[PDB]
Design an enzyme around this catalytic site. Structure first.
Site, PDB file in Angstrom:
ATOM      1  N   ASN A  49     -10.033  -3.010   3.012  1.00 50.39           N
ATOM      2  CA  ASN A  49      -9.869  -2.955   1.543  1.00 50.39           C
ATOM      3  C   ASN A  49     -11.188  -2.728   0.813  1.00 50.39           C
ATOM      4  O   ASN A  49     -12.253  -2.635   1.418  1.00 50.39           O
ATOM      5  CB  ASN A  49      -9.242  -4.263   1.017  1.00 50.39           C
ATOM      6  CG  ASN A  49      -7.748  -4.387   1.298  1.00 50.39           C
ATOM      7  OD1 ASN A  49      -7.046  -3.422   1.726  1.00 50.39           O
ATOM      8  ND2 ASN A  49      -7.265  -5.611   1.100  1.00 50.39           N
ATOM      9  N   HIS A  68       0.845  -1.249   0.000  1.00 55.57           N
ATOM     10  CA  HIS A  68       0.000   0.000   0.000  1.00 55.57           C
ATOM     11  C   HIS A  68       0.855   1.263   0.000  1.00 55.57           C
ATOM     12  O   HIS A  68       0.468   2.312   0.535  1.00 55.57           O
ATOM     13  CB  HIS A  68      -1.012   0.025   1.202  1.00 55.57           C
ATOM     14  CG  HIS A  68      -1.950  -1.144   1.190  1.00 55.57           C
ATOM     15  ND1 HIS A  68      -3.245  -0.987   0.765  1.00 55.57           N
ATOM     16  CD2 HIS A  68      -1.812  -2.435   1.627  1.00 55.57           C
ATOM     17  CE1 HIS A  68      -3.935  -2.185   0.915  1.00 55.57           C
ATOM     18  NE2 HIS A  68      -3.067  -3.097   1.409  1.00 55.57           N
ATOM     19  N   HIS A 124      -3.030   0.866  12.032  1.00 57.60           N
ATOM     20  CA  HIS A 124      -2.678  -0.488  12.399  1.00 57.60           C
ATOM     21  C   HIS A 124      -3.982  -1.066  13.004  1.00 57.60           C
ATOM     22  O   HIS A 124      -4.543  -0.447  13.968  1.00 57.60           O
ATOM     23  CB  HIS A 124      -1.530  -0.427  13.417  1.00 57.60           C
ATOM     24  CG  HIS A 124      -1.178  -1.782  14.004  1.00 57.60           C
ATOM     25  ND1 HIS A 124      -0.383  -2.690  13.362  1.00 57.60           N
ATOM     26  CD2 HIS A 124      -1.614  -2.367  15.132  1.00 57.60           C
ATOM     27  CE1 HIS A 124      -0.314  -3.829  14.146  1.00 57.60           C
ATOM     28  NE2 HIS A 124      -1.083  -3.612  15.204  1.00 57.60           N
TER      29      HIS A 124
END
Ligand code: HEM
Ligand code: HEM
Lengths: 726, 726
Positions: A174, A101, A365
């Protein structure tokens, strides 16, 4: 004074349509758009106007054009401390890109829930409809470097940092509802297989190469997410027109301690929309920054990206009631079986000031959860919890990356951690350990509770032996790919076949193409045969006889899996090319521009040169770009007003503009003598669906064109474009 | 999960044409190609066949598919040291990219001089025609990141590391003979202006944006290298087909101590060739790795990149004899005034094994010279001496980057430096300082002398006061751009006009476009007026009356500045597309392939699907790629044999393939019934220069095509292409 005396070097601090003004840092373009996190960044924002140029130690510089030398033609001297700081800082500008990414684009915004969710979760940010949480969202591709192109075929990342009053929650998702692999242990194998190959570092931004398809051919668990990547989901029109998913099943924990399983969704309020492959591929060359640009411009225009957060909720007692394992991240939960409950709205309404400082250094995260959420034993999620902190250490320089402004919480944070590279906070606590008496044990632990309590894990029962073993419940690979395939429209299926066929044609070792075809024959015979035909491969009688995998909980389709099966089109924020000539009919142009304005659709006026042209009535028309400069790839529709059409009728670029728009299924509208261009695209006298034509741009012409735009593309033209050399 | 039974997964370890085999690590593709540097890397080359998979500590792995968990559906355990080391290494794979020249492609090779140069230099690598020096060469673009595209418009870097017996010499040059700026103090300002703008990090790989042209319009010292970049020099066909230049004047020092000024050149033995803009820009989308791929595949095919090193030599007493300053890196030395003397040949004959370990970690630095060379006071060269070592420090992790295998000298190196991160060498010397008695002062200093001596600087006289001031002799900015302009052919001039026109049309602030046009009017009014017409700008009377700058020492043109004015074409290593049909006339294909083979020209066989087609005589023809998959962009010429032309006559992709090739000036040859494609490119029946046509392919047909390919492109067709819709 190098600025023009007219002040045209500076954009207006007001919303303006794409291309009207130069783009600018968010705080200069939209100074009055505020939220708690943007306000908290004030301490580190640096201006510039009216200040002297200095070194980093505050010493004013007199001559920033020359090094110190012995004689004006002489050697440069070591004592030039000003040169030495400027070059040292430049020599150390770059930091490592993200491992995956690396290419992405980001904005600020805010989230609000529609109602309190206290019955199912004690998470503070979902407790009150009047509680506004700032967010920062980064969208991304997966494989390519930070300098790679936007409109590649790839999965996209959709990462949101919620700055809550009880800690940062990062939802790191995603744009497809599953992942390629089941166990994090395989992540470096899968990523190595999709990334450029190690001897020569090719190809960038593409899974169309041998090692990706070699891995897929050997690991059928990948096939579900490969189907989504080969569909038009792999080439979105914009970050605003794609869905988002957390993929894993997580838990929500309420104040009574009851756990509910949850998967997270984002629904794009602008609707779902994708490009077609030839367009996407050529756009990576004509504008490799197209999605970054379109996001920033939408925000500058006021066309804020809006998304609705939704939850799929499954009670603890229904964990085993489906044909697939809820913990398997290669399986989706069909919305026919478990609907998405609407939870709140997120609006992205301000761009960053500095891309490196805010986008490149941001750190998301998925381990960053808050009280009210918890994890599950999904074995891909479990391995993610190891990777995000460690990587941010080498990428961002040490263990204090939370003190980089964009990553800082807006709520209090206090503990006994100390030191590390780049330590900003100066701790005054006499104690750096607990338990301590020398500071009365502060800062102190907080018991769990319904609000403002310490985090406690849900007490899930664990039972089994220490094993490296894949659960048998995860060993099913073909039913969800088949469900995806059967849910797509016929033109979506054609585009899937074409994705697979194009990608496997780039695989140099033919046996890998054969092995992938064999896998496709375990999903759906029609799909396998149509790819095989494009590859010059014949299925064997054994392959023709493979029995299809079972339906998923009795479903043979689910239309929520399609981009287009259920209309959801929205024209606001889209853009139309208007191809001018040197004597435009001003009546046509007034009607066209004002109809587009009313629906929030932007226009770009194009010609064969820059400057101005003059309309029939004397109106001076400024030109945004040339036909080659802003190709049809970058617009949603093309309109050609009447006027002196002989001016552009033999212009190859203008003719090609329409042929390219026509091939890529875009609506085209031709007024008056512009209907002479019907011969270039071979349109019949009686006309055809998807081409708007009339004597003038008045009456129903613009309404018809806007109706075509709301449907996105003219799918019925696909058989017609097969010929046409464009 | 094994290899196919037929061995088709493994490339043959012999030279093969592009596409014939999968590409491979150099040591596997060409195990018998050796040189002293490649052999020295054998200590660190790691094989794989027949070896057990292990951790980095040597523990054999039994299961590399699963994390350790408490039950097969349970949580992952902290004690999985195998998972943790694999994910930890993966999480730390990336290192910072180079600040500039981040996108690059490299190979190994060797150099040797044609004769001893001992009368002008004592450098050991130029002292003996039979003493070979290994090299490692990296070619690069300048602005874009390591994942950006190859065929952007940009300056290219051409860096060569010579592993000499008397130390590493790095010749760190570009593909044009001047730079944009005069003093290193401005490098961070210039680089920041060309790089993506800081608020939104757009655009990648492009100087077509406001900040670059703002800087150019305010710093006319940039205009000479801007002219080069806007010409077709900014879009080379291959790294094999561009020139190199060290830019700065350096010194050669012979054994008598005599200094001669020198500028370095590389001449491509494959000749000079460039793309055209629209082709280059679309190829960034269709194949962003085109130059990296072409270089790798030329080396695999045996079409080794060859370049002649050349020196322009000026005696010390002629320092001030031109009308420009020799120390000004914005000034070139015309070869009409100072010829390039041929010095040696470099051949690149092996690809690396691992891109990251060899290409990404290579460190080149122009301060790495050897005895027999020296610097001059060029104020851009002087500042470069600070930057390369310092940057290689954060990029490569510490001061021991010379111990990274690709960077190691092959000659002896011993000194008193110790420690630093990742120290490999274990010093046994009891002393780490000198002078010492405890190791009898070893290693010892070495007096300078004719061979194998210590480095001593040339004792140049320095006289002046400590100033930050540009030499007045450097303040002339328009004569060299004008010389360049006037030395270009009429088509090359047209392409320069188009390059400025295209770029300034993407500048959003119109005043910047106007200020660039005013600078152009100081160079040549024909250039200025042609760009202003494309921008809808009218020059003022004052601008029409600006006096042209003086000739450069009496020259009105120098044809060595043009890519094409002096024929130098070499077809070996070029590639033709052959558009097949399902019943190819095998006699045509025989004649075509035989003629191409004789000249070392490769073919790619294309069709509307993959797999095989069978010719009229039964020959089975494997298909390299589809018409869409390997577009005309990627070849030098297109040939269409006869056969069943009805199979492809109405294929839109086949017709478009010819239209794109025609628009891009490529030679096209049509045999037999393939002549019916003349109709799609909408021109003549008597024929046209550039289109070879005949009843069959044969000696005369192939001769005519090959002569066209030797001239690179069909420039005469330029006026016929503005009407073609492609
Ligand atoms: C459901 C599967 C996954 C999803 C949806 C996902 C999503 C993402 C996204 C969206 C980003 C970029 C965040 C940003 O914009 O900065 C990211 C980064 C990353 N991912 Fe994941 N990922 C998944 C699986 C994994 C696995 C299994 C691992 C490793 C065990 C992993 C390791 C990383 C690392 C190393 C980064 C770079 C993070 C950083 O430098 O800040 N990902 N992932
Ligand atoms: C004649 C003008 C110049 C030429 C021909 C030149 C050439 C190049 C080339 C070819 C590289 C890439 C080497 C490689 O492949 O790794 C490079 C890298 C670099 N250059 Fe220069 N450059 C010039 C001016 C400068 C100036 C004035 C500075 C700074 C004062 C500079 C600083 C850099 C730095 C920081 C790198 C990255 C080096 C690395 O990370 O290893 N360059 N240059």
């Amino acid at each position: 004074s190098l600025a023009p005396e007219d002040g045209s070097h500076r954009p207006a601090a007001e919303p303006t349509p794409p291309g009207a003004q130069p783009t600018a840092p968010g705080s200069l373009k939209a100074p009055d758009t505020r939220n708690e996190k943007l306000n908290s960044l004030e301490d580190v924002r640096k201006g510039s106007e009216n200040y002297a140029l200095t070194t980093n130690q505050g010493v004013r510089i007199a001559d920033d054009q020359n090094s110190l030398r012995a004689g004006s033609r002489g050697p440069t001297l070591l004592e030039d401390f000003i040169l030495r700081e400027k070059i040292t800082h430049f020599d150390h500008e770059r930091i490592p890109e993200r491992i995956v990414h690396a290419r992405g684009s980001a904005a600020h915004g805010y989230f609000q829930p529609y109602k309190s969710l206290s019955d199912i979760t004690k998470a503070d940010f979902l407790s009150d409809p009047n509680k506004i949480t700032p967010v920062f969202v980064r969208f991304s591709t997966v494989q390519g470097g930070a300098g790679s192109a936007d409109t590649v075929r790839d999965i996209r990342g959709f990462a949101t940092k919620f700055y809550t009053e009880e800690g940062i929650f990062d939802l790191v998702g995603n744009n497809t509802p599953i992942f390629f692999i089941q166990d994090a242990h395989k992540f470096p194998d899968f990523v190595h297989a999709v990334k450029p190959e190690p001897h020569w570092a090719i190809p960038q931004g593409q899974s169309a190469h041998d090692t990706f398809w070699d891995y897929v051919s050997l690991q059928p668990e990948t096939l579900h997410n490969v189907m989504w990547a080969m569909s038009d989901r792999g080439i979105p029109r914009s970050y605003r027109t794609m869905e988002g998913f957390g993929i894993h099943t997580f838990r929500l924990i309420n104040a009574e301690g009851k756990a509910t399983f949850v998967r997270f969704h984002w629904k794009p309020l602008a609707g779902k929309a994708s490009l077609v492959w030839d367009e996407a591929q050529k756009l990576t060359g004509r504008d490799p920054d197209f999605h970054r640009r379109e996001l920033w411009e939408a925000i500058e225009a006021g066309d804020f990206p809006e998304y609705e957060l939704g939850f799929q909720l499954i009670p603890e007692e229904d964990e085993f009631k489906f044909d697939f394992d809820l913990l398997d991240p290669t399986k989706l939960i069909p919305e026919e079986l478990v609907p998405v409950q609407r939870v709140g709205k997120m609006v992205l309404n301000r761009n960053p000031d500095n891309f490196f400082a805010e986008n490149e250094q941001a750190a998301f995260h998925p381990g960053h959860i808050v009280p009210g959420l918890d994890f599950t034993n999904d074995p891909l999620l479990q391995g993610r919890l190891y990777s995000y902190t460690d990587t941010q250490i080498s990428r961002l320089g040490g263990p204090n990356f939370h003190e980089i402004p964009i990553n800082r919480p807006t709520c209090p944070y206090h503990n006994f951690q100390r030191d590390g590279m780049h330590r900003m906070g100066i701790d005054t606590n006499p104690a750096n350990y607990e338990p301590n008496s020398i500071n009365d044990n502060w800062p102190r632990e907080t018991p769990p509770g319904p609000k403002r309590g310490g985090f406690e894990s849900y007490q899930e029962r664990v039972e089994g032996n220490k094993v490296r073993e894949r659960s048998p419940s995860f060993g099913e690979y073909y039913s969800h790919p088949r469900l995806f395939w059967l849910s797509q429209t016929p033109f979506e299926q054609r585009h899937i076949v074409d994705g697979f066929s194009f990608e496997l044609s780039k695989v140099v070792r033919p046996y890998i193409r054969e092995r992938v075809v064999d896998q496709l024959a375990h999903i759906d015979l029609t799909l396998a045969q149509a790819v095989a035909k494009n590859l010059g491969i014949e299925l064997t009688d054994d392959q023709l006889n493979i029995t299809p995998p079972p339906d998923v909980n009795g479903l043979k389709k689910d239309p929520s899996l399609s981009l287009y099966a259920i209309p959801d089109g929205d024209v606001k924020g889209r853009v139309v090319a208007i191809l001018l000539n040197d004597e435009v009919r001003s009546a046509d142009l007034l009607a066209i521009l004002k109809a587009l304005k009313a629906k929030g659709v932007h226009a770009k006026l194009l010609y064969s040169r820059m400057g101005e042209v003059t309309a029939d009535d004397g109106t001076v028309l400024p030109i945004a770009a040339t036909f080659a400069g802003a190709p049809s790839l970058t617009v949603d529709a093309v309109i050609v007003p009447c006027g002196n059409i002989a001016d552009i009728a033999d212009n190859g670029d203008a003719n090609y503009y329409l042929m390219e728009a026509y091939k890529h299924l875009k609506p085209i509208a031709l007024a008056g003598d512009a209907r002479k261009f019907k011969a270039t695209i071979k349109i019949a006298d009686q006309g055809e669906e998807g081409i708007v034509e009339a004597d003038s741009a008045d009456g129903s012409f613009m309404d018809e064109l806007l109706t075509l735009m709301a449907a996105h593309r003219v799918w019925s033209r696909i058989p017609k474009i097969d010929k046409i050399p464009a």
